């Protein structure tokens, strides 16, 4: 009966962020998690500088209601270091250093030329239009906190501070396997009542795109000795171990009694569609997640449950799943109260540019193609029933795992 | 006047031919690869007829007896009932199992009453009900995915379900990348008189790499005609695109301009955008060239809005390779000046009535890079538009994974 929301918090409350770190050049850090706060070695900007193209003025010389002749120029990398007579001003550009004694800067459009110099319109508050040493970042301060996922937004900032490498948390290692007589490897021919192993690929691909180190142990022979050996291998080299299918999620069999002999594992019945079963627990040196065999449920269950667990473990201080947005359906949606339903939709603009969702087609877990046709989940509240054109609907766009 | 972003974009894309050279890779190595030849099913999906429900495989005659029905067997998962089934008796079956030879319908267990002399049923049974059927999802010889599809977690596991191990994808686009200038220092050594740290090259390298290109970083080239030429000759002979990330002229006259003019036909555009303006583009002997401005915010925007879509098209992708825009209200006043299509940065968030709105990240000048980190979207303000007051509709474009 249990809820998604309750399963999630149970999993995450049990889990401890990793802290082993390594130090890497900036070009190697995309998607990695900072292990320590980055601290600025210098001030930004270097020197007080002008915010506008215009004139630098003393405040005395302004109140004198008399046009100020231009003594000179200050640009980005030729300051004005001549002398500066009273009753004059200095031409200056944005980013140029303010010359000594400068109290304020006035936009060019906000003076006017006169025969005997420049005249100032508006009034002139002291310190105005000056960018002060360190107003953006001061030396000693924390530019980015530990726990930050590094991206093109942050790494060029770190490089402008002159820093070549930063310490980041090591990648989460995840071991992955499947099991079952029916499963064939892709390239052989399809036996008795047999299918191609797909889940293990979906999960391997998802893990790699999430930044994990993956140890794929293949399809394990349908035999308790082979399964135990697989678990001992997986557990000894990973932080998380994932059965992508065919280990029990509930049903009593030899796969279950080997799980119970190998750690504290709980088996859950979750109030979602598609999906329902999911196994989770500690082995001796790693967490375990067991997925149901159905691809859709396996893929949904991984994305909504395993993905957030991996984010917490990686050290990320961020909610590692796209946020939702309320939107109008252009489609009748069939839906059955009782279960939190992650349907799949297609999000696109109406002719006014506002966003709405069409369904992809049938929402049954006998086909995988709704992930490809879709670009989002329609997340229909647990107790809601059907849904008609024009109603209001929660929506989670697919992250990069689907595009 | 001034040239519009759209016009420039059009000009770059109309001149460019998608790559067609190709490699054959195992499915685990295709994430983000452009499929090169259509994927054609070798098989029916589902193979074999099969059940949509847990329940019982009946026969229409045995039902309308009115009369309870002993279970003679089970059909499972990867283990079917391939052993005889006698009149008057039903069969137990789980979702996804082969229906037995002779099955005519299936009843979900919810419409049965377990009886003593065997199983009883309800609501009468429509013919073929809950049977799925060989080939009804995909037929053999059909195109499942067409060439030009970016392969992803959505497509690859389906390609595997069809028994396929390897597919041809278009080879990665190769992009050479440098910067030039005595001003420029490596994070590493210390900061001489006018000097800065070279950030743009890092930025572009990180983007290229996440776009899935093959990057060839030639580093900082010395202020010297022969060094600069050599780099172009080498970059141009190894790559499909060559990008200067700063330091090569985007229009001002210098030794770099004359070299450019000498090694291919380069145009020097001024775009009606902000931030930015100057961009360089054109053909070299065996490669395209994009020449970015020096300011970091400017080079980042320009890469993101022009170079990124050119790469998507070179790559063979048949999808226009950038987020899409949506209409949303501002909750900030936005200072904007007519004349330039302004790509401001904003923070797109939900309010207390759950409607999506945009705020500004703060100051929008090109002297700081923080807006990329603080924001999660561009506010894409129209070229002739003036300031924008709280409450007005505004076009917004979420940041793609390059920024989070």
PDB file of N, CA and C in Angstrom, chain A residues 202-246:
ATOM      1  N   UNK A 202      19.377  -0.414 -19.901  1.00  0.00           N
ATOM      2  CA  UNK A 202      18.781   0.886 -19.599  1.00  0.00           C
ATOM      3  C   UNK A 202      19.408   1.492 -18.364  1.00  0.00           C
ATOM      4  N   UNK A 203      19.596   0.639 -17.384  1.00  0.00           N
ATOM      5  CA  UNK A 203      20.169   1.004 -16.129  1.00  0.00           C
ATOM      6  C   UNK A 203      21.664   1.331 -16.282  1.00  0.00           C
ATOM      7  N   UNK A 204      22.426   0.519 -16.992  1.00  0.00           N
ATOM      8  CA  UNK A 204      23.835   0.828 -17.244  1.00  0.00           C
ATOM      9  C   UNK A 204      24.001   2.209 -17.928  1.00  0.00           C
ATOM     10  N   UNK A 205      23.169   2.490 -18.932  1.00  0.00           N
ATOM     11  CA  UNK A 205      23.226   3.744 -19.647  1.00  0.00           C
ATOM     12  C   UNK A 205      22.877   4.850 -18.720  1.00  0.00           C
ATOM     13  N   UNK A 206      21.850   4.648 -17.892  1.00  0.00           N
ATOM     14  CA  UNK A 206      21.423   5.731 -16.993  1.00  0.00           C
ATOM     15  C   UNK A 206      22.502   6.041 -15.948  1.00  0.00           C
ATOM     16  N   UNK A 207      23.084   4.987 -15.381  1.00  0.00           N
ATOM     17  CA  UNK A 207      24.156   5.165 -14.451  1.00  0.00           C
ATOM     18  C   UNK A 207      25.327   5.926 -15.031  1.00  0.00           C
ATOM     19  N   UNK A 208      25.641   5.697 -16.287  1.00  0.00           N
ATOM     20  CA  UNK A 208      26.865   6.270 -16.833  1.00  0.00           C
ATOM     21  C   UNK A 208      26.611   7.727 -17.099  1.00  0.00           C
ATOM     22  N   UNK A 209      25.384   8.040 -17.441  1.00  0.00           N
ATOM     23  CA  UNK A 209      25.061   9.415 -17.738  1.00  0.00           C
ATOM     24  C   UNK A 209      24.934  10.169 -16.453  1.00  0.00           C
ATOM     25  N   UNK A 210      24.630   9.501 -15.346  1.00  0.00           N
ATOM     26  CA  UNK A 210      24.590  10.164 -14.064  1.00  0.00           C
ATOM     27  C   UNK A 210      25.939  10.360 -13.447  1.00  0.00           C
ATOM     28  N   UNK A 211      27.013   9.915 -14.089  1.00  0.00           N
ATOM     29  CA  UNK A 211      28.352  10.054 -13.554  1.00  0.00           C
ATOM     30  C   UNK A 211      28.856   8.901 -12.695  1.00  0.00           C
ATOM     31  N   UNK A 212      28.181   7.766 -12.654  1.00  0.00           N
ATOM     32  CA  UNK A 212      28.681   6.667 -11.840  1.00  0.00           C
ATOM     33  C   UNK A 212      29.679   5.807 -12.556  1.00  0.00           C
ATOM     34  N   UNK A 213      30.519   5.107 -11.794  1.00  0.00           N
ATOM     35  CA  UNK A 213      31.381   4.041 -12.293  1.00  0.00           C
ATOM     36  C   UNK A 213      30.550   2.771 -12.196  1.00  0.00           C
ATOM     37  N   UNK A 214      30.426   2.073 -13.314  1.00  0.00           N
ATOM     38  CA  UNK A 214      29.525   0.915 -13.431  1.00  0.00           C
ATOM     39  C   UNK A 214      30.352  -0.366 -13.570  1.00  0.00           C
ATOM     40  N   UNK A 215      29.953  -1.379 -12.827  1.00  0.00           N
ATOM     41  CA  UNK A 215      30.514  -2.690 -12.937  1.00  0.00           C
ATOM     42  C   UNK A 215      29.371  -3.632 -13.318  1.00  0.00           C
ATOM     43  N   UNK A 216      29.280  -3.920 -14.600  1.00  0.00           N
ATOM     44  CA  UNK A 216      28.229  -4.750 -15.130  1.00  0.00           C
ATOM     45  C   UNK A 216      28.700  -6.187 -15.055  1.00  0.00           C
ATOM     46  N   UNK A 217      27.942  -7.000 -14.340  1.00  0.00           N
ATOM     47  CA  UNK A 217      28.331  -8.374 -14.056  1.00  0.00           C
ATOM     48  C   UNK A 217      27.544  -9.317 -14.997  1.00  0.00           C
ATOM     49  N   UNK A 218      26.844  -8.755 -15.956  1.00  0.00           N
ATOM     50  CA  UNK A 218      26.172  -9.549 -16.965  1.00  0.00           C
ATOM     51  C   UNK A 218      24.937 -10.248 -16.432  1.00  0.00           C
ATOM     52  N   UNK A 219      24.542 -11.325 -17.106  1.00  0.00           N
ATOM     53  CA  UNK A 219      23.426 -12.151 -16.677  1.00  0.00           C
ATOM     54  C   UNK A 219      23.969 -13.259 -15.816  1.00  0.00           C
ATOM     55  N   UNK A 220      23.489 -13.374 -14.591  1.00  0.00           N
ATOM     56  CA  UNK A 220      23.971 -14.413 -13.687  1.00  0.00           C
ATOM     57  C   UNK A 220      23.191 -15.690 -13.914  1.00  0.00           C
ATOM     58  N   UNK A 221      23.887 -16.833 -14.005  1.00  0.00           N
ATOM     59  CA  UNK A 221      23.223 -18.154 -14.158  1.00  0.00           C
ATOM     60  C   UNK A 221      22.090 -18.372 -13.100  1.00  0.00           C
ATOM     61  N   UNK A 222      21.000 -19.021 -13.533  1.00  0.00           N
ATOM     62  CA  UNK A 222      19.835 -19.281 -12.665  1.00  0.00           C
ATOM     63  C   UNK A 222      20.103 -20.422 -11.683  1.00  0.00           C
ATOM     64  N   UNK A 223      20.755 -20.113 -10.564  1.00  0.00           N
ATOM     65  CA  UNK A 223      21.363 -21.102  -9.686  1.00  0.00           C
ATOM     66  C   UNK A 223      21.836 -20.376  -8.444  1.00  0.00           C
ATOM     67  N   UNK A 224      21.478 -20.835  -7.246  1.00  0.00           N
ATOM     68  CA  UNK A 224      21.792 -20.088  -6.021  1.00  0.00           C
ATOM     69  C   UNK A 224      23.273 -19.880  -5.764  1.00  0.00           C
ATOM     70  N   UNK A 225      24.126 -20.803  -6.191  1.00  0.00           N
ATOM     71  CA  UNK A 225      25.547 -20.656  -5.945  1.00  0.00           C
ATOM     72  C   UNK A 225      26.080 -19.519  -6.812  1.00  0.00           C
ATOM     73  N   UNK A 226      25.633 -19.452  -8.067  1.00  0.00           N
ATOM     74  CA  UNK A 226      26.080 -18.394  -8.957  1.00  0.00           C
ATOM     75  C   UNK A 226      25.588 -17.000  -8.524  1.00  0.00           C
ATOM     76  N   UNK A 227      24.418 -16.931  -7.888  1.00  0.00           N
ATOM     77  CA  UNK A 227      23.820 -15.695  -7.462  1.00  0.00           C
ATOM     78  C   UNK A 227      24.543 -15.205  -6.231  1.00  0.00           C
ATOM     79  N   UNK A 228      24.905 -16.116  -5.341  1.00  0.00           N
ATOM     80  CA  UNK A 228      25.587 -15.701  -4.138  1.00  0.00           C
ATOM     81  C   UNK A 228      26.924 -15.164  -4.531  1.00  0.00           C
ATOM     82  N   UNK A 229      27.554 -15.767  -5.521  1.00  0.00           N
ATOM     83  CA  UNK A 229      28.911 -15.361  -5.857  1.00  0.00           C
ATOM     84  C   UNK A 229      28.881 -13.998  -6.511  1.00  0.00           C
ATOM     85  N   UNK A 230      27.839 -13.767  -7.308  1.00  0.00           N
ATOM     86  CA  UNK A 230      27.576 -12.480  -7.948  1.00  0.00           C
ATOM     87  C   UNK A 230      27.415 -11.386  -6.919  1.00  0.00           C
ATOM     88  N   UNK A 231      26.686 -11.657  -5.833  1.00  0.00           N
ATOM     89  CA  UNK A 231      26.425 -10.673  -4.772  1.00  0.00           C
ATOM     90  C   UNK A 231      27.670 -10.419  -3.964  1.00  0.00           C
ATOM     91  N   UNK A 232      28.491 -11.437  -3.800  1.00  0.00           N
ATOM     92  CA  UNK A 232      29.692 -11.218  -3.035  1.00  0.00           C
ATOM     93  C   UNK A 232      30.653 -10.393  -3.871  1.00  0.00           C
ATOM     94  N   UNK A 233      30.670 -10.623  -5.177  1.00  0.00           N
ATOM     95  CA  UNK A 233      31.507  -9.838  -6.053  1.00  0.00           C
ATOM     96  C   UNK A 233      31.030  -8.370  -6.102  1.00  0.00           C
ATOM     97  N   UNK A 234      29.773  -8.194  -6.470  1.00  0.00           N
ATOM     98  CA  UNK A 234      29.183  -6.885  -6.548  1.00  0.00           C
ATOM     99  C   UNK A 234      29.437  -6.122  -5.260  1.00  0.00           C
ATOM    100  N   UNK A 235      29.097  -6.710  -4.120  1.00  0.00           N
ATOM    101  CA  UNK A 235      29.148  -6.016  -2.826  1.00  0.00           C
ATOM    102  C   UNK A 235      30.546  -5.578  -2.448  1.00  0.00           C
ATOM    103  N   UNK A 236      31.541  -6.323  -2.886  1.00  0.00           N
ATOM    104  CA  UNK A 236      32.901  -6.067  -2.485  1.00  0.00           C
ATOM    105  C   UNK A 236      33.529  -4.976  -3.292  1.00  0.00           C
ATOM    106  N   UNK A 237      32.881  -4.482  -4.322  1.00  0.00           N
ATOM    107  CA  UNK A 237      33.566  -3.452  -5.077  1.00  0.00           C
ATOM    108  C   UNK A 237      32.744  -2.212  -5.381  1.00  0.00           C
ATOM    109  N   UNK A 238      31.572  -2.085  -4.755  1.00  0.00           N
ATOM    110  CA  UNK A 238      30.613  -1.038  -5.077  1.00  0.00           C
ATOM    111  C   UNK A 238      30.036  -0.472  -3.833  1.00  0.00           C
ATOM    112  N   UNK A 239      29.408   0.682  -4.000  1.00  0.00           N
ATOM    113  CA  UNK A 239      28.689   1.351  -2.929  1.00  0.00           C
ATOM    114  C   UNK A 239      27.246   1.029  -3.012  1.00  0.00           C
ATOM    115  N   UNK A 240      26.765   0.732  -4.219  1.00  0.00           N
ATOM    116  CA  UNK A 240      25.374   0.321  -4.437  1.00  0.00           C
ATOM    117  C   UNK A 240      25.332  -0.844  -5.392  1.00  0.00           C
ATOM    118  N   UNK A 241      24.439  -1.787  -5.178  1.00  0.00           N
ATOM    119  CA  UNK A 241      24.376  -2.979  -6.009  1.00  0.00           C
ATOM    120  C   UNK A 241      22.951  -3.058  -6.515  1.00  0.00           C
ATOM    121  N   UNK A 242      22.771  -3.213  -7.818  1.00  0.00           N
ATOM    122  CA  UNK A 242      21.444  -3.134  -8.388  1.00  0.00           C
ATOM    123  C   UNK A 242      21.091  -4.381  -9.198  1.00  0.00           C
ATOM    124  N   UNK A 243      20.018  -5.063  -8.805  1.00  0.00           N
ATOM    125  CA  UNK A 243      19.468  -6.138  -9.623  1.00  0.00           C
ATOM    126  C   UNK A 243      18.512  -5.448 -10.566  1.00  0.00           C
ATOM    127  N   UNK A 244      18.783  -5.485 -11.847  1.00  0.00           N
ATOM    128  CA  UNK A 244      17.935  -4.860 -12.850  1.00  0.00           C
ATOM    129  C   UNK A 244      16.787  -5.762 -13.261  1.00  0.00           C
ATOM    130  N   UNK A 245      16.637  -6.922 -12.614  1.00  0.00           N
ATOM    131  CA  UNK A 245      15.580  -7.846 -12.968  1.00  0.00           C
ATOM    132  C   UNK A 245      15.897  -9.291 -12.589  1.00  0.00           C
ATOM    133  N   UNK A 246      14.869  -9.976 -12.091  1.00  0.00           N
ATOM    134  CA  UNK A 246      14.946 -11.392 -11.864  1.00  0.00           C
ATOM    135  C   UNK A 246      15.406 -11.790 -10.487  1.00  0.00           C
TER     136      UNK A 246
END
